[PDB]
Symmetry: D2
Subunit: 337 residues, 4 copies
C-alpha cells in the first residue's frame, strides 16, 4: 500500500518530482495538488494522468486526511508557510530549498518540529545522495586521508539570465556546497569572506561574476569556493578535500573519450539538469522508503536548513562589506542527534 | 493500473528482478511465481511480501489469465521451454540469457514469435542500456569517427570457481560482448578465431585462461576480444572503437580519486554485480513501459538471441580446433525490422 | 669555443650544475670553483675530474681572467655580494634564487646592471623552462581561454626537516610560484593575505603548516596558493588557470598506469629533485647559448629577482600580521622593457 | 677530449643528429660528413658552421684517421656496406634502423663484430631510451605484475605520402615495436599473422591500411599490434601489457588540460618528430659516454638488428600469405650473452 502524496507548487520542479514519483520510483502516488495558479495545477493532473484532488490552497490540501506526505515545491519565499502548516497538520514534508528565506523562518520550523516530537521535515539538498559525494563521505568516515585541513571547490555555470543577480550566487548557487561540505566534514562554519576577481566579459554589467568565497570551520578547516556562473565552457562541479595524509577528489560525470582532430577529450555537461538526476531519484525514493520503514524522514534535517540559512546571510553580508563576517549559530538541539 | 508479472525461476537473478520490480521500478507487480524448487519460491513470496500465486510449474502459471508478462530466469538449459510456452500462451516474455542453449532452440522461438505476429520476446542483454554503451552508440550513429574499422575490448574477472570451464568463457562471459558489438556497429559476424596465450598462474589446471578471440564482420570490421577471468586485480570491462577519422572508448565506472603514499589512483570494482546495476534497472523499466505504451517489447530481439547462439557455437568450435571457423547465419526475417 | 665558467659555492646544487655542464650540456666548461670550505671545493674538483682552480675566495676567482661567467650557488645571504662583484668585474652571472635576501639588495643589483648597458644577470627560476609551464604560456599568449581571472595552485612536499621554518614556506618554497605566475599572466602583484588552516599532525610544533596565500594582481586576477610541506603522500605541484572562456591546467609528470589490487593508478614523485631536472638542463643551456650568440643572458631578469624579493617580503609580513599586506613596487625601468 | 665523429649521409635524420651533437650533447664533435650528393653535404657543413671535411665517398671518410666513430644515416640499403667497412676499419658505429635490409646482411655484420672482440655497433632503436618504456621495463624487472601474458599496442600516424607502401608498415613503422617489445619481455618471437581490416577511406588505393599483426613469442606471450598510418586524428603510440596479477600501460605525452566548449581535453601530437626527441638525445649521449668510459658501445646490439631483420621478414611474408608464417632464429651467440 503506497504512500499518498500531496504536492504544494506545481511548477518546473514540482512537475519533475511528480513525474519521478509517478513513472520512475516505487511506493507512492500523487493524490492531491495545489498551486498559486490553480489552472496550471489542473493541467498537471491531466498531463500526468493523476488520481488527484485539486485544492484551492495548502490548508485545504493539508486538511485532507487521505494525504500522508507533502512536497513543498512552490515559489521560494512561499515555502516557510506550507512547511509550518504541514508540521502542525502533522504530515510528512519534503521541502525543496530554501527551507525559508530567513534564519528566523527556519528557527520557527525547527521549534515547531521539536514539539511534534519526530522528524517530519526533509530538506531537498540532493547532493548528499550523489554517488560521488557518497564516496567522498565513506572515505572520510574511514579515515583514509586523516584529518581534513582544506577544501577547494568550484561551482561553474555556462551562463545565467538577465534576472540573475550578485547575491543569488550565494543564496541560490553556493547553497548546495554550503550544505554538503559541513555534512562531509562534520564541522560547523565560523567565518566567511568574499573576494571579487576581475569581472568576466560574459557577465552582464549588473552582475558580479566570478566570486570567491572563503569559509573557515570551528575546527579550522579552510574552504575556498569558486563561483563562476558565466564560465561559458559548461556546467561543472569540482571538489577536492586535502587531508593530513592524502587527497580525495570528486569525479567528473561519466563520458566516453574521443581521439579526433588533435585532441584527446571527454564531454562536459551543458545543462545543470542532467548533472544530478540520479541524486534526485535516490533522494525522493529515500523520502518514501524511510517513512514506510521507520515512520520518519532520514535526509537533511530542518536544522540543516537553519544552518544553510544562517551561513547564507553571513555570505550576503560579506558580499557587500568586503569584510570577514562571523557565522553565529545557536546550539544544536539534541532533538537532531 | 500495473503490469502483472509472473516469474519462472526464483534463484539469485530472479530474486533480483523481483526486488527491483517490487521496490525500485514503477508500473508492475509480481502476481505469480514458479520454481523447480517449489519450496524456494514460497520463501521468495514471503521474503518480498508479494501478492503472488505459487504454481507447481510453468504451464500452470501461463494458464493463469491474470498474468500478462513473464520473467524467464531459470536454470539456463531450462529457458527454451518456458519461452516457447509463453509465446504460444501469448504472454510477454523477458528471457535472461541464454535464449536457448542451441542455435536450433533459438530458431524455434523465432519461428514461433513470427506466427503470433508481434514482439513478445525481449532478451536480457543489459549492456545496451548502459549509459556508456549508449554514448558509444549515439556517437557512431552521428558519424563522429566515420566508418568503424577495428574494435579492441577486454572482459576481465578477478577469479572464477572450480566449476568454471574453458568453454564457459565464450558461452557465458563473451556472450555480452557478442551481442552489444554487432548492435553498436550494425554488422553481422562472419568468422571467429581463438588464440591461447601462456596460461595464467591464477587459473586452475583444468581451465584455459586467458583467451583471445578474433572476430571479423561481413563489412570487414576486425574485433579482437581479450578474456581473462583470473586477472586478480578486479572486474573490468574495456571497449575501444577505432574509426576512420577518430577513436571512441568506454569510460571507467565513476570513482573518487586518491592521492596517498606515492600513488594517484581511482577504484576498480571487484564485484561484477555492481558494474551494471543501473542497466538492469533501465532494462526492466523499459520492458514494462514499452508494453504499457506500445503493446510490444523494445529491447534485444529473439533474432538477436539466435545470433548470439550461432556465434557462440562458432567460438566453441574455434576453441577446440584452433581454426578460423565460419559464422553461418540464416537470412534476417523482415519480421525483425 | 667553450664558455669558461667559474662556480662560487660547490654546494648541493653547485655540484649538480657542475655535473650537467660537464657531462650533459654543450659549449662550456668549469675552470674555477671557490667554496667557503676549501676542502669541500677540493673534493668536488676530484669528484668530477675537473680541470679547475681552487680559490680561497670569490675575489681571487673573479680575478682569474679565464672565467667568462660565474654560477652563484652558495648560501642565500652570500649572493648579493658575489653578484655585485661579478657585475663590477663584468662577468656573466647565473644566480640561483634568491637574487638577494632583501628587496633593497636586489634593487642595488638592478642599478649596477643598468649601468653596464647589457644584461649580465640571469636568475635561476627554472620553472619558466618547464614544458608544462611553457605550454601554459603558449595557450595564454594565444588567447585560448581569453582573460585570466583566477589561478589555483598548490606546492606540496612529503616532509621537511627541523630546520624548515614558517617563513621558509614563502621564502624558499612559494618563491617559484611567485615568479612563474606573473611571468605567465603578465601582471604585477598588489596584495597578499595569509590564512592558516588547522595545523597538520605531520608538522613540527614550531611550524605553521599548511598555509594558504591569496594574492591579487593590479589587473584583478585572484591567486590562491596552498603550501603544505608535510603532506606525506608525495611531492606535487598543481596549477590551474581559470579564464573567461575556458580553463587550462598543468600536467602531472609522465608515469605509466597500473591496474592492481582494486586500484588504477599513476606514480607520484617522492623527491623534489626529480620534478624539474629537465628545466635545469634547458636553463643552463640557454645561459650558455644566449651568451655565445647574443653577447648577453636571456632568462629571468634581475628585475624579476626584485619583484620576487618584494612580493615574498609582503608574504612574510602577512604571516605574522594576519591582515591584507601591501605590495608596492618601483616602476619598471626602461632597461627591462 | 671530444669523441671525433663522421657522418655518412647528411640526410634529414643525419642533419638532426649533427645538430644535437653540435648544439645539445656533451663530449663529441662532427669532423667529417660524406653524402652521395656532394653539394648536399656542403650545404650542411655551412648550415651548422661545422669544422668538418667533405668526402666523395665513405672509403675516404673512414680513411680519415681523425674520425673515431661514424653515424650511418643514409638510405636503408646503403647501410650494410658502410657498416661492414666501418667494422673492418675498426671505428665505432651508430647505425640508424635498419641495420641491414636483409636478415642475412645483418648476420654478416654480426659475424664481423664477434671477430673484432668488442662491441662497436649500436643500432638506433631509440624507444629503449624513452622514459615511458624505461618505466615499463623497470616495473617488469621488479615483477610488479608477475608474468607478462598479452601485449596490446598501436602505432598510428595522421597520413602518409604516395611513396608509403604496404610492407613499409612492418619495415619502417612496426619495426620499432618489434625491437622494444622483445627487449621489454625478454622473449624471442616465433610466429606472425597479418589480418587486414576494412580498408580506410584515408588510405590510397595501392595501400593496405589499417593492418593488425598478431605475434606469438616462444614463451606464450601474444602480441597484437595495430598499424594505422592514415588515422587522421594524430600521431599516437599506445602500449599495454597484461600480466598475471596486473596491467601496466605507456603514458600519453605530457600536455596541459583544457576545458572549453563542452569538452575536457589534452593535446595529441601531430608530428612523429616531436614524439621521441628526448629519446634521441639520450641515445647519442649514451653512444658517446659508453665509448669514453668503457671503450665500447652499449645500446641495442647488432644481434637485435638481426632479430629485427628476421621478424620483419616473416611479417612481410604474412602480408602476402595470409597464413601463420614462421620466425626461425639462429641461436644467440656467446658474444651477446
Ligand atoms: N631552484 C631550486 O630548486 C634550488 C636552489 N637552491 C638554492 O641554492 C642555494 C644553496 O643551495 P644548496 O646546495 O641547497 O645549499 P648548500 O648549503 O649545500 O650550498 C652552500 C655551499 O656553498 C658554500 N658557500 C656558502 N657561502 C659561500 C660564499 N659566500 N662563497 C663561497 N662559498 C660559499 C658553503 O660552504 C656550502 O658548501 C640557496 O640560495 C638555495 O635557495 C637550493 C636547492 C634547490
Ligand atoms: N628512427 C627514426 O625514427 C628514423 C630513422 N630513419 C632512418 O634513417 C635513414 C634515412 O633517413 P632520412 O633522413 O629520413 O632519409 P634521407 O633520404 O633524407 O637520407 C638519405 C640521405 O643520405 C644520402 N645517402 C644515401 N645513401 C648514401 C651512401 N651510401 N653514402 C653516403 N650518402 C648517402 C642521400 O643523398 C640522402 O641525402 C633510413 O634508414 C631510415 O629508416 C628515418 C627517419 C626516422
Ligand atoms: N534542489 C534543487 O537543485 C532545486 C532546483 C530547482 C528549484 N529548486 C527550488 O524549488 C522551488 C521551486 O522551483 P521551481 O523552479 O519549480 O519554481 P517555478 O517558478 O517553476 O514554479 C513554482 C510553482 O509554484 C507555484 N506557487 C507559487 N507560490 C505558491 C504558494 N504560495 N502556494 C502554492 N503554490 C505556489 C507557482 O504558481 C508555480 O507554479 C524553489 O524554491 C527553488 O529554489 C531547487
Ligand atoms: N544478464 C546477466 O548478466 C545474467 C546474470 C546472471 C545470470 N543470468 C542468467 O539468468 C539465468 C538464471 O541465473 P541464476 O544465477 O539466477 O540461476 P540460479 O541457479 O541461482 O537459480 C535458478 C533458479 O531457477 C530454478 N529452476 C531451474 N530449472 C527450472 C525450470 N525448468 N523451471 C522453473 N524453475 C527452474 C532453480 O530451482 C533455481 O531456483 C541463467 O540462465 C543465467 O545464465 C544472466
Amino acid at each position: 500500500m503506497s504512500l499518498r502524496i500531496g504536492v504544494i507548487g506545481t511548477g518546473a520542479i514540482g512537475k519533475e518530482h511528480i513525474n519521478r514519483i509517478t513513472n520512475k520510483l516505487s511506493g507512492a502516488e500523487i493524490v492531491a495538488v495545489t498551486d498559486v495558479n490553480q489552472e496550471a495545477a489542473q493541467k498537471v493532473v491531466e498531463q500526468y494522468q493523476l488520481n488527484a484532488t485539486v485544492y484551492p490552497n495548502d490548508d485545504s490540501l493539508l486538511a485532507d486526511e487521505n494525504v500522508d506526505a507533502v512536497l513543498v515545491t512552490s515559489w521560494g519565499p512561499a515555502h516557510e508557510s506550507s512547511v509550518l502548516k504541514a508540521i502542525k497538520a502533522q504530515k510528512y514534508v519534503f521541502c525543496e530549498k530554501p527551507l525559508a528565506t530567513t534564519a528566523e523562518g527556519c528557527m520557527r520550523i525547527v521549534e515547531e518540529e521539536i514539539k511534534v516530537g519526530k522528524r517530519l521535515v526533509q530538506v531537498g539538498f540532493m547532493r548528499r545522495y550523489d554517488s560521488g559525494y557518497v564516496q567522498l563521505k565513506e572515505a572520510l568516515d574511514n579515515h583514509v586521508i586523516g584529518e581534513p585541513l582544506m577544501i577547494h571547490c568550484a561551482h561553474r555555470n555556462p551562463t545565467v539570465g538577465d534576472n540573475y543577480t550578485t547575491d543569488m550566487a550565494v543564496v541560490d548557487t553556493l547553497v548546495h556546497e554550503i550544505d554538503v561540505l559541513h555534512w562531509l566534514v562534520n564541522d560547523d562554519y565560523e567565518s566567511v569572506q568574499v573576494i571579487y576577481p576581475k569581472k568576466s566579459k560574459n557577465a552582464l554589467p549588473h552582475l558580479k561574476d566570478p566570486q570567491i568565497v572563503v569559509i573557515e570551520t570551528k575546527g579550522g578547516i579552510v574552504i575556498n569556493a569558486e563561483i563562476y556562473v558565466n564560465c561559458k565552457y559548461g556546467y561543472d562541479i569540482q571538489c577536492e578535500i586535502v587531508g593530513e595524509d592524502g587527497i580525495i577528489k570528486l569525479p567528473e560525470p561519466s563520458s566516453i573519450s574521443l581521439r579526433k582532430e588533435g585532441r584527446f577529450s571527454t564531454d562536459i555537461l551543458m545543462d545543470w539538469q542532467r548533472r544530478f538526476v540520479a541524486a534526485y531519484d535516490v533522494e525522493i525514493q529515500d523520502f518514501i522508503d524511510s517513512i514506510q520503514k521507520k515512520g520518519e524522514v532520514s535526509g537533511p534535517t530542518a536544522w540543516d536548513g537553519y544552518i544553510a540559512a544562517v551561513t547564507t546571510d553571513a555570505c550576503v553580508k560579506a558580499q557587500e562589506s568586503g569584510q570577514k563576517e562571523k557565522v553565529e549559530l545557536k546550539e544544536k538541539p539534541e532533538f537532531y542527534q
